[PDB]
Amino acid sequence: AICSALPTIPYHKLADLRYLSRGSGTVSSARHADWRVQVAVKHLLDSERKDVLREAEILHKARFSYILPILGICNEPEFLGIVTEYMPNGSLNELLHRKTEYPDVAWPLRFRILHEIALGVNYLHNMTPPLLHHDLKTQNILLDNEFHVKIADFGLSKWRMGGTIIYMPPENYSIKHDIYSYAVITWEVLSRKQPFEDVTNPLQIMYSVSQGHRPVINEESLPYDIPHRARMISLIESGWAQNPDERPSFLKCLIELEPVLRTFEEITFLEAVIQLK
Amino acid sequence: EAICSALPTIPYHKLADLRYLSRGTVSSARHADWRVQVAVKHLDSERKDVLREAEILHKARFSYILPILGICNEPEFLGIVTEYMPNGSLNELLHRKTEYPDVAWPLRFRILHEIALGVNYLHNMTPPLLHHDLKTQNILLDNEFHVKIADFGLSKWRMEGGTIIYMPPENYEPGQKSRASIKHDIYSYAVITWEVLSRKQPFEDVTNPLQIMYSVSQGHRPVINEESLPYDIPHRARMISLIESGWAQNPDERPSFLKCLIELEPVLRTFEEITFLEAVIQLK
Numbered sequence: 001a002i003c004s005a006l007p008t009i010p011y012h013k014l015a016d017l018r019y020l021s022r023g024s025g026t027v028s029s030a031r032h033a034d035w036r037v038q039v040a041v042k043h044l045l046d047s048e049r050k051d052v053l054r055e056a057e058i059l060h061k062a063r064f065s066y067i068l069p070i071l072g073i074c075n076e077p078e079f080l081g082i083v084t085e086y087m088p089n090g091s092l093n094e095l096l097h098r099k100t101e102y103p104d105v106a107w108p109l110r111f112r113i114l115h116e117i118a119l120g121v122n123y124l125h126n127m128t129p130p131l132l133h134h135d136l137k138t139q140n141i142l143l144d145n146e147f148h149v150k151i152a153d154f155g156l157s158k159w160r161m162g163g164t165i166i167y168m169p170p171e172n173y174s175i176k177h178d179i180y181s182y183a184v185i186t187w188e189v190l191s192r193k194q195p196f197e198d199v200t201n202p203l204q205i206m207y208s209v210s211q212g213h214r215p216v217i218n219e220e221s222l223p224y225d226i227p228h229r230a231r232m233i234s235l236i237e238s239g240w241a242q243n244p245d246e247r248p249s250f251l252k253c254l255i256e257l258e259p260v261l262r263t264f265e266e267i268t269f270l271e272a273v274i275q276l277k
Numbered sequence: 278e279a280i281c282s283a284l285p286t287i288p289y290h291k292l293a294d295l296r297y298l299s300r301g302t303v304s305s306a307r308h309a310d311w312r313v314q315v316a317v318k319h320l321d322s323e324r325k326d327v328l329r330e331a332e333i334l335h336k337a338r339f340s341y342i343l344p345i346l347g348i349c350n351e352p353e354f355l356g357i358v359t360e361y362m363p364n365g366s367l368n369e370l371l372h373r374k375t376e377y378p379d380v381a382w383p384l385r386f387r388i389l390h391e392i393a394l395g396v397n398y399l400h401n402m403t404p405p406l407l408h409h410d411l412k413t414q415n416i417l418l419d420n421e422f423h424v425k426i427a428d429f430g431l432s433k434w435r436m437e438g439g440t441i442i443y444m445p446p447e448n449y450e451p452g453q454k455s456r457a458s459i460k461h462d463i464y465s466y467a468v469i470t471w472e473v474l475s476r477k478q479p480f481e482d483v484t485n486p487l488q489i490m491y492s493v494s495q496g497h498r499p500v501i502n503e504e505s506l507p508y509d510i511p512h513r514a515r516m517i518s519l520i521e522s523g524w525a526q527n528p529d530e531r532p533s534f535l536k537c538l539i540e541l542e543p544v545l546r547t548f549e550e551i552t553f554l555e556a557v558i559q560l561k
């Protein structure tokens with residue numbers, strides 16, 4: 001009964017428009033001339049038009065604390081795009097793998113990111129009807145100014161009625177896809193390693209995965225000093241199980257993570273972030 | 278053509294660990310399915326009012342506006358579910374000097390910038406939304422002390438009470454013109470700015486509130502001197518100019534939030550990013 005409409009932003013209101021990246025399309029940064037804030041813009045064909053509008057509708061409907069906030073839609077004959085909040089700290093991929101820029105990523109912050117990814121996905125799954133992301137990667141887990149999570153890219157997302165394959169369950173070559181992706185992300189967050197490092201061809205990964213092989217769990221990838229190592233390994237191994245029926249719900253995953261997050265005092269999250277600056 | 282998002286209905290029984298915060302009445306809880314902490318603000322005429330506020334919060338969604346999560350609409354219970362703000366209000370930050378001996382200038386300037394960003398957004402909506410009850414009490418602070426504007430009970434679409442220190446003199450005897458005024462929020466903002474930079478209670482030496490009303494209507498304002506506003510305040514002259522134009526007796530002489538923002542942007546650029554992080558750790 002209470003309906004909020006997504007604003008239409010005239011393209012001419014986006015000042016200092018600059019290229020960022022390219023992929024479910026091109027990302028550019030800008031400032032809104034009237035709102036005085038920094039924004040991000042994700043931008044001829046008719047079928048491609050419906051796709052951008054579909055994504056915008058999904059982001060607008062799926063608004064929550066751990067979902068990338070949509071500010072409006074650019075819907076002009078000359079230009080079509082999605083306006084969102086600008087995320088100054090990039091993606092989780094950049095945080096994990098830029099080891100020169102980030103020598104230390106403290107455990108409290110790693111656990112908080114993992115908790116917020118699960119909170120964000122759980123919300124999507126609890127919607128009516130449930131929304132299934134179906135394209136979770138470290139690349140589309142964005143980080144705001146204080147390194148809080150914002151889930152982006154709802155291009156492959158589906159209402160319950162390409163690129164990299166390392167986050168894709170073997171049966172995809174389902175309400176149990178996002179958990180598989182999450183298990184791989186957890187492994188990657190705790191190891192700062194690229195899954196299947198020794199693999200030349202992505203087909204060799206697809207073959208290994210279909211045979212039940214997974215990123216390695218040993219002392220080298222996951223050192224014995226990782227807080228709650230046993231519990232995290234259990235979560236990872238259940239999450240990426242060959243049998244989808246054996247993978248947990250996000251609820252179960254969240255009930256598992258809540259006692260872990262309670263072991264960290266609030267100031268340790270602040271200290272982890274200042275260490276990155 | 279319009280993309281319309283519906284506000285969720287939350288069954289009251291999905292709110293676990295419901296605990297009293299303040300007195301409508303504010304309670305804290307956790308959503309049983311979403312696994313997050315929330316806040317709950319809870320007759321037929323009083324029903325229409327809660328729904329009106331919820332509609333406004335849902336439509337006015339922005340980075341510096343309190344995010345609404347859903348509505349409780351049951352025969353047995355009616356309330357607004359929002360994100361939980363762990364660091365309270367700006368009032369508590371400014372006046373709890375034992376709990377907060379220092380509040381660094383970078384953080385004070387960021388709060389002022391975010392309040393102006395939040396109000397500017399409301400004023401730029403179609404039709405414009407005018408808050409008309411801005412107080413330090415309803416500028417809420419999140420986990421990293423970012424601003425969230427709350428209380429849209431007196432808010433109006435441009436087409437039982439408390440404090441009056443943020444109210445312009447022309448609004449004392451209300452009507453059509455008063456409810457219409459597009460220069461009310463800037464007056465409130467000028468008083469908030471003065472209060473943020475001084476950490477003083479506006480009209481501290483005045484005992485009775487009706488006497489404040491008498492002074493304000495004569496053109497008297499909270500004092501601007503070396504005691505209230507020390508000479509060491511960054512960008513003191515510029516801030517005093519903003520304050521004095523914002524609370525001008527003539528509403529026509531008060532600036533827009535755009536003008537205000539354009540003045541604040543060069544000020545905020547003088548603070549390095551780490552100083553905001555340091556200001557927050559100092560508060561913990």
Ligand SMILES: CC(C)(C)S(=O)(=O)c1cc2c(Nc3ccc4scnc4c3)ncnc2cc1OCCO
Nearest residue numbers: 020021027040042084085086087088090091152153
């Ligand atoms: C992901 C990055 C870090 C490589 S980026 O430079 O592209 C970047 C992207 C941002 C972004 N992307 C975006 C925009 C609109 C939509 S609609 C659905 N998903 C998206 C995703 N949004 C916000 N801020 C971004 C910041 C980025 O990098 C700047 C810091 O490096």
Ligand SMILES: CC(C)(C)S(=O)(=O)c1cc2c(Nc3ccc4scnc4c3)ncnc2cc1OCCO
Nearest residue numbers: 298299303316318357359360361362365366427428
């Ligand atoms: C304002 C306080 C700090 C005195 S509080 O204890 O009441 C408090 C309020 C919070 C809050 N309020 C709220 C809830 C729903 C609506 S709908 C329109 N306006 C509101 C305002 N919202 C979120 N978190 C709150 C936290 C509070 O206390 C934190 C500890 O001081």
